[PDB]
Paper text:
Human glycolipid transfer protein (hsGLTP) forms the prototypical GLTP fold and is characterized by a broad transfer selectivity for glycosphingolipids (GSLs). In human GLTP, a glycolipid headgroup recognition centre located on the protein surface enables selective binding of the GSL head and ceramide amide groups via multiple specific interactions. To elucidate the structural dynamics of the GLTP–GSL dimer and associated adaptations, we comparatively analyzed nine novel crystal structures of wild-type GLTP (wtGLTP) and the sulfatide-specific mutants D48V and A47D/D48V complexed with N-lauroyl-containing monosulfatide (N-lauroyl-3-O-sulfo-galactosylceramide; hereafter referred to as 12:0 monoSF) and disulfatide (N-lauroyl-3,6-di-O-sulfo-galactosylceramide; hereafter referred to as 12:0 diSF) in different crystal forms and compared them with previously studied GLTP–24:1 monoSF complexes.
To elucidate the dynamics of intermolecular interactions in the GLTP–disulfatide complex, we comparatively analyzed two crystal forms of wtGLTP and two crystal forms of the D48V mutant complexed with 12:0 diSF. The crystals of the wtGLTP–disulfatide complex represent ‘open’ and ‘closed’ conformations of the dimeric arrangement. However, adaptations within the open and closed dimers necessitate slightly different overall lipid conformations. The first noticeable deviations in the surface contact areas occur in wtGLTP–disulfatide complexes, which probably indicate a slightly different mutual orientation of monomers compared with wtGLTP–monosulfatide complexes. Interestingly, ligand adaptations also emerge with wtGLTP complexes bound with disulfatide. In contrast, the 6-O-sulfo group adopts different conformations/positions that depend on the protein (wild type or D48V) or the crystal type.
Numbering used by the authors:
A (entry chain A), B (entry chain B): 3 to 209
Amino acid sequence: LLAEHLLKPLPADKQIETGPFLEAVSHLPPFFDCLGSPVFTPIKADISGNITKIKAVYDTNPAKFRTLQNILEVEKEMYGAEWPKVGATLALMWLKRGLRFIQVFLQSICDGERDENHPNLIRVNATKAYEMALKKYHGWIVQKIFQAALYAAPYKSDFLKALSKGQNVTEEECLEKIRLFLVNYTATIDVIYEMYTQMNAELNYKV
Amino acid sequence: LLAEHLLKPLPADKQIETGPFLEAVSHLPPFFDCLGSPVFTPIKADISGNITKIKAVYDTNPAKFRTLQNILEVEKEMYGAEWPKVGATLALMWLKRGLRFIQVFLQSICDGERDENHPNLIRVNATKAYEMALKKYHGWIVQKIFQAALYAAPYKSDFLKALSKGQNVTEEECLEKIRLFLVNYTATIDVIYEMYTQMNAELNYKV
Ligand SMILES: CCCCCCCCCCCCC/C=C/[C@@H](O)[C@H](CO[C@@H]1O[C@H](COS(=O)(=O)O)[C@H](O)[C@H](OS(=O)(=O)O)[C@H]1O)NC(=O)CCCCCCCCCCC
Ligand SMILES: CCCCCCCCCCCCC/C=C/[C@@H](O)[C@H](CO[C@@H]1O[C@H](COS(=O)(=O)O)[C@H](O)[C@H](OS(=O)(=O)O)[C@H]1O)NC(=O)CCCCCCCCCCC
């Protein structure tokens, strides 16, 4: 899945380019097929959702929107007091919290975080990724959903196995494959988070 | 909403005109917006997408697919073992369940079914809806999720109002306006169901 479509390394000036960024992340939603139960299908559709809205905006004037920063700043002027709860800016605001979940989730598995009593489960890693990436932005109902949903969770091994289908590589080799992917993935997500902060564009509302 | 677009009548042969089906039902996702909670947004995604896929498979030869019945009888021949669990057929297989939920749900409200313990919840109605149209194609986890999502359900009052979009209607006038929609709506659906029975194209798998 992930380490064929590696993420371009972070540029000097820290300016992510929309087009290629979208090409790269448009590869992550099938992530969720590895999770292996159609419960998760709607999450996946939600993120694809975001990626498309961004790609739409971008496609409308690829020069005006060469970078992600260009998207945020151009929309800020363009829409109202409405901003940033509008347009691609909103799409990204959320997309990034999905990317982060993935990001923290993989890292956790990659770091031998486990439940000493039940090593082959993913609760504690999903939960930690959920704690840090989405929980702040979800009401009680939704976490009650997240909570059920954590029973569609596959076994850890079965994820990995599945997360590297065919390919042909130890569980171990598999984890390094991630550890490399994670380097740029993480650098990138952190810039996007920076960007949002510096442009007062994060919103704290819940769902 | 629901009654600026009403489903055509029913032909002498019960055959269903596809473009005027796709056109007509695609004013129904907007609906879920009326429940007033971003919880239900993914729900609508999955109907939106049912329609999309049904539509493209149509566009590709609107002569061969002039009817819904045509969709099934053609796809049936176009794959082996594959059909029914393929293409617009499967798309419509699921669409009819959402579309049924939407009917039965309203039908209930429109008939004043409620809980005397609180006639401004719609939770007994969502439930009849769900049990009758979708519960047996969902596995235990989805069902949990439904039960949780049922807590983001609005009140009957506001739900009715959100529907009205302040066309300045009275509240039992709004009920009335639905019952009208419900007529041909409840037919079309019933037919699609017969279709699917009589074609041997139902499947029973849970999710
Ligand atoms: C961040 C929160 C934490 C994570 C949350 C985890 C996710 C929770 C989501 C739970 C499930 C939501 C409901 C969606 C259910 C769908 O899976 C089902 C069946 O989906 C079908 O799957 C099929 C896949 O085929 S299969 O793998 O071989 O099965 C098809 O893809 C089909 O699309 S198609 O165009 O390709 O043909 C597709 O609809 N959809 C439904 O159940 C219909 C939903 C109608 C909802 C009605 C509203 C009820 C809600 C109550 C409102 C008060
Ligand atoms: C009949 C079946 C039972 C009924 C089913 C009930 C519904 C189940 C699904 C529950 C919800 C699933 C999770 C998604 C929740 C989303 O509402 C949130 C917010 O999403 C944003 O909502 C917004 C709505 O706007 S707002 O009202 O102004 O807020 C925007 O639409 C924005 O999209 S945008 O591109 O157009 O801009 C959109 O992402 N989505 C998330 O939190 C992202 C989820 C990330 C993936 C989670 C991965 C963890 C899953 C567990 C894995 C073990």
